[PDB]
Amino acid sequence: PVWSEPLYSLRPEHARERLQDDSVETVTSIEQAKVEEKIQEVFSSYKFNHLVPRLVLQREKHFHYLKRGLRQLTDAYECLDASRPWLCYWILHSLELLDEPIPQIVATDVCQFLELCQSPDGGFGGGPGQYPHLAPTYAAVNALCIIGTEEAYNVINREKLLQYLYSLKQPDGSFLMHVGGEVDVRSAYCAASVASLTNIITPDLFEGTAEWIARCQNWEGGIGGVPGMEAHGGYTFCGLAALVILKKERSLNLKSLLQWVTSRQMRFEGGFQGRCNKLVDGCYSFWQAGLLPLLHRALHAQGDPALSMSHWMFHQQALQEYILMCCQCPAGGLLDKPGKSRDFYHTCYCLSGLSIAQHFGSGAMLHDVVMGVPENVLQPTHPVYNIGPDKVIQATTHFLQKPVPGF
Amino acid sequence: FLSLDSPTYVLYRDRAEWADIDPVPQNDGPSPVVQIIYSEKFRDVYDYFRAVLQRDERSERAFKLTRDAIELNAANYTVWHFRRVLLRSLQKDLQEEMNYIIAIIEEQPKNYQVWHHRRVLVEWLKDPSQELEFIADILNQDAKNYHAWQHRQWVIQEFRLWDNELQYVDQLLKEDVRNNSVWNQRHFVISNTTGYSDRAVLEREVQYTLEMIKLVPHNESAWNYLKGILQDRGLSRYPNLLNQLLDLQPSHSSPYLIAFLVDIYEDMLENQCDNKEDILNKALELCEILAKEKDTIRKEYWRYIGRSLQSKHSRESDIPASV
Ligand SMILES: Cn1cncc1CN(CCN(CC1CCN(C(=O)OC(C)(C)C)CC1)S(=O)(=O)c1ccccc1-c1cccc(CCC(=O)O)c1)c1ccc(C#N)cc1
Ligand SMILES: CC(C)=CCC/C(C)=C/CC/C(C)=C/COP(=O)(O)OP(=O)(O)O
Ligand SMILES: [Zn+2]
Numbered sequence: 001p002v003w004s005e006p007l008y009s010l011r012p013e014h015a016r017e018r019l020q021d022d023s024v025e026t027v028t029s030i031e032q033a034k035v036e037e038k039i040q041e042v043f044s045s046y047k048f049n050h051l052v053p054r055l056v057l058q059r060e061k062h063f064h065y066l067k068r069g070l071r072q073l074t075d076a077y078e079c080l081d082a083s084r085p086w087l088c089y090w091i092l093h094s095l096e097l098l099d100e101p102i103p104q105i106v107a108t109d110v111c112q113f114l115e116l117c118q119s120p121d122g123g124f125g126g127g128p129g130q131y132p133h134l135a136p137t138y139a140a141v142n143a144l145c146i147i148g149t150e151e152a153y154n155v156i157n158r159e160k161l162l163q164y165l166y167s168l169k170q171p172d173g174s175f176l177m178h179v180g181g182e183v184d185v186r187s188a189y190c191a192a193s194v195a196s197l198t199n200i201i202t203p204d205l206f207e208g209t210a211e212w213i214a215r216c217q218n219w220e221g222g223i224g225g226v227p228g229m230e231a232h233g234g235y236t237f238c239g240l241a242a243l244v245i246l247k248k249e250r251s252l253n254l255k256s257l258l259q260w261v262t263s264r265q266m267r268f269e270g271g272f273q274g275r276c277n278k279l280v281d282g283c284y285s286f287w288q289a290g291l292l293p294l295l296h297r298a299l300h301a302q303g304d305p306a307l308s309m310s311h312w313m314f315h316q317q318a319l320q321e322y323i324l325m326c327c328q329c330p331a332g333g334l335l336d337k338p339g340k341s342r343d344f345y346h347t348c349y350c351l352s353g354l355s356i357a358q359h360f361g362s363g364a365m366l367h368d369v370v371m372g373v374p375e376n377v378l379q380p381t382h383p384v385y386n387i388g389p390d391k392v393i394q395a396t397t398h399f400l401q402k403p404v405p406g407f
Numbered sequence: 408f409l410s411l412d413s414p415t416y417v418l419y420r421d422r423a424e425w426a427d428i429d430p431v432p433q434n435d436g437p438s439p440v441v442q443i444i445y446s447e448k449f450r451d452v453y454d455y456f457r458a459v460l461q462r463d464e465r466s467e468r469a470f471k472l473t474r475d476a477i478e479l480n481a482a483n484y485t486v487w488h489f490r491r492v493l494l495r496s497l498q499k500d501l502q503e504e505m506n507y508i509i510a511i512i513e514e515q516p517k518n519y520q521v522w523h524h525r526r527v528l529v530e531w532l533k534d535p536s537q538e539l540e541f542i543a544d545i546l547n548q549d550a551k552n553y554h555a556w557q558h559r560q561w562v563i564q565e566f567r568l569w570d571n572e573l574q575y576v577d578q579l580l581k582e583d584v585r586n587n588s589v590w591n592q593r594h595f596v597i598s599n600t601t602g603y604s605d606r607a608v609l610e611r612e613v614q615y616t617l618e619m620i621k622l623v624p625h626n627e628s629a630w631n632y633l634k635g636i637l638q639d640r641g642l643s644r645y646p647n648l649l650n651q652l653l654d655l656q657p658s659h660s661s662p663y664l665i666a667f668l669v670d671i672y673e674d675m676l677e678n679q680c681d682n683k684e685d686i687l688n689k690a691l692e693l694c695e696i697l698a699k700e701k702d703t704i705r706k707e708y709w710r711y712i713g714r715s716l717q718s719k720h721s722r723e724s725d726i727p728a729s730v
Pocket of ligand 1: 083281336344346
C-alpha cells in the first residue's frame with residue numbers, strides 16, 4: 001500500500017520501541033536514552049528533510065579507505081602497532097566482502113610482511129621482532145588464507161605452529177594467549193581456528209578444552225571470558241565457534257544461549273549490544289549475529305524440526321537498517337554508532353555482520369534479504385572463521401594434503 | 408625521571424646517557440603493508456626499545472625506557488614481558504611497581520596488559536590487601552569495566568575474600584539496579600558461598616528480585632537473574648511463580664514478563680503438567696503476541712519457539728501417521 005513504510009525502523013509503530021525507564025533514572029538508562037535520541041534523529045532525517053530514504057552501501061568510498069589503509073596508516077594507529085596482522089586481516093577481509101580483487105603485488109607484499117612477523121619458535125607476533133601471541137597468530141592465518149595462494153599457504157611454519165600451541169596449553173584444558181600471558185576463551189578460539197585451518201590438530205591438542213569452554217557459559221546463557229564472568233558477545237562468539245570446530249557444541253546449553261543472544265538485539269536501534277544493559281555497537285553485528293548461523297547449524301545437526309528454512313533467528317532487516325543508516329562514514333569506512341569515528345575494525349565487522357544478515361543458507365536451502373539497492377549485496381562469510389567460505393574450503397583442502405606434524 | 412608528557416621531555420637520540428647505543432629501526436621489509444606513520448616521539452622510543460631488547464640489556468635505563476614504550480602503546484605485550492624480566496633481574500621493589508601499575512590502570516583501564524601485569528605483581532607479592540579498594544575506585548568511574556570485575560573475582564576467589572562482597576554488590580545495585588555486571592557478581596558471590604540449593608537463600612533472592620522487578624519492571628537484568636537462579640531446577644518446579652507473575656500483568660507488564668510466562672509454560676509442558684493442551688494454547692497465544700506486537704525485533708525467535716512447542720507438545724505429537 002501507499003501509506004506503508006517498507007523500512008522497519010521508520011514505521012510509526014517503531015516509536016513504541018523507545019526505552020521505558022519506569023520513571024527510575026540510573027546511569028544505564030540515561031546513557032541508553034542518549035543513544036536512542038541520536039539514532040531517532042538519524043531515522044527521522046529523511047522525513048524532516050522531505051526526501052525518500054535510499055539505503056546505499058557506499059562501496060566506492062569504503063574501497064578507497066581500505067585500498068589506502070592496506071599500505072599506509074596515520075599515527076592514529078600507533079595503539080595498534082602490536083596488532084599489525086589484525087590490520088591486514090580486517091582490511092583484506094573487508095575487501096573480500098566487497099568483492100574487490102587482491103592485486104598479486106599486494107598479495108606478495110602481505111605474505112612477506114607476515115613472514116617477518118612470524119616467530120622462529122612458532123606463531124606470529126604483532127609486528128616484526130615482536131614475541132608471538134595467539135591473537136595476531138589468528139589474524140595472520142586468516143589473512144594468508146584470504147590471499148589463498150601457494151605462496152601465502154607456505155608462509156606458515158606448521159611444525160613450529162603446533163609446538164607453539166602446545167607451549168600455551170594448560171592442564172585444565174585452557175590456553176594462555178601467549179607465554180607469560182593470560183588465559184581466556186579467546187585463546188581456545190584462536191588456537192582451534194589456526195589449528196583446524198592448517199591441519200595440525202593432534203589427538204590430544206584440545207584435550208579438556210571443550211569442557212573448559214563449557215565452564216564459561218553462565219547463568220545468563222551466554223559465555224564469559226573465564227568461568228564466573230558476565231556473558232559477552234565477543235567471548236560467546238569465541239566459545240561457540242571453537243566448540244563448533246571441535247564438534248562439541250552440545251557441551252553447551254544451546255537453548256539458554258539462543259535465548260541470550262536473541263535478547264541482545266536492540267528493539268529500537270536494530271543493532272546488537274555486547275552484554276545486557278549496555279549500548280548498541282556495530283561490531284556486534286558480527287560477534288552477536290554471527291552466533292545465529294552457528295546455533296542454526298548445531299540445532300539442525302540435532303534434527304530440530306522447527307528451524308526456519310529461509311531466515312536466521314534474528315531480525316535480519318532491522319540489523320541491515322542499523323548498519324546501512326547508522327554505521328557508515330560518508331568519507332568511507334564504518335563505525336560503532338553515530339558520533340563515533342571510522343576505523344578498520346568496525347569496517348571489517350560491520351560488513352561481516354551485513355553479509356550474515358543478507359545471506360541465509362542451510363544445506364541446500366538458500367535465501368537472501370538485501371535491504372536498499374541490490375548493489376548492496378556482499379560476498380558471503382563463513383560464520384566460524386569469518387573469511388569467505390571459498391577461502392576456508394580452499395585452505396583446508398590444501399592443508400589436508402599435508403600430514404599432521406609428527407604424523 | 409622524565410615523564411613522557413613532561414614539557415621538557417627529550418628524545419632518546421638526544422640523551423647523553425644513551426649515546427653508546429645504536430637504535431634499531433623497525434624491519435618492515437622493502438615494500439611495507441599497513442605501515443604506520445609513527446610520530447617522532449613514538450618511533451624514537453621504539454627504536455631504542457628494539458635495541459635493548461635485541462641486546463637483552465637488563466639495566467636501570469632499559470627499565471625506565473619500558474615505562475615510556477608502555478605509555479606510547481600499552482597493548483605492546485612484548486614490552487610488558489621485558490619489563491617483568493627487568494623487575495626480577497634488577498630486583499626492583501614490587502610495591503613501587505604496584506604504585507606504578509595503579510596509576511597506569513587509572514589512566515588506561517580498558518587495556519588487557521595492565522590488568523594482567525597487576526595480577527602478576529599480586530601473585531609475586533602474595534598480598535591482596537590493596538585490591539578490593541583499588542578495584543572499587545576503578546568501578547566508581549566505570550561500574551561495568553569488564554577487566555575490573557574479572558580481577559575482582561580472581562582476587563576474591565584466590566585469596567578467599569568473600570566476607571564483604573554481597574554488601575558491596577548491594578551498594579552498587581542501589582546506585583544502578585540496571586548494572587548487569589553487578590547482578591553477575593551477586594550470582595558469583597552466592598554460588599561460591601552458600602550456593603542456591605539452600606532454600607532460605609533461594610527464597611530470599613527471589614523475593615529480592617521480585618521486589619526489584621516491581622520497582623523497575625522494564626529492567627532486563629532483574630528478569631534474567633530471576634530466570635537464571637530458577638531455571639536449572641526447572642521453572643515448573645515452582646508452582647506459585649506463575650500465579651505471582653500473572654498478578655504483575657495488570658500494572659507491571661513488559662515483554663520480559665510475557666516472555667517469562669512462555670518459559671514457565673514451556674517447562675510445564677516438558678514435565679507433562681495437568682491440562683497439557685490448555686497450557687500449550689496459552690503459550691502459543693503469547694508467542695504470537697510477542698512475535699506480532701510486543702517483541703517484534705525477536706519475531707523469528709518467537710515463531711521458532713511457537714513451532715517448537717507445537718511440534719513436540721500438541722495432542723497429535725505422539726500420534727502415528729496411520730491414525
Ligand atoms: C570502543 N570500541 C568499540 N568497539 C571496539 C572498540 C575499541 N576496539 C578494541 C576492541 N576489542 C575489545 C574491547 C573493546 C572495548 N575496550 C576498549 O575500548 O579498550 C581500549 C581500546 C580503549 C583500550 C576493551 C577492548 S579488542 O581490541 O580486545 C579486540 C576486538 C575484536 C577482535 C580483536 C581484539 C583484539 C585482538 C587481538 C589482540 C587484542 C589485544 C589487546 C590485548 O589482548 O592485550 C585485542 C577497537 C579495536 C580496533 C580498532 C581499530 N581499527 C578500533 C576499535
Ligand atoms: C578472536 C577475538 C580476539 C575475539 C574477541 C572479541 C571481543 C569483542 C571481545 C570483547 C572483550 C571485552 C573486554 C569486552 C568489553 O568491552 P566494553 O565493556 O568497553 O564494550 P561493551 O560496553 O560493548 O561490553
Ligand atoms: Zn565496536
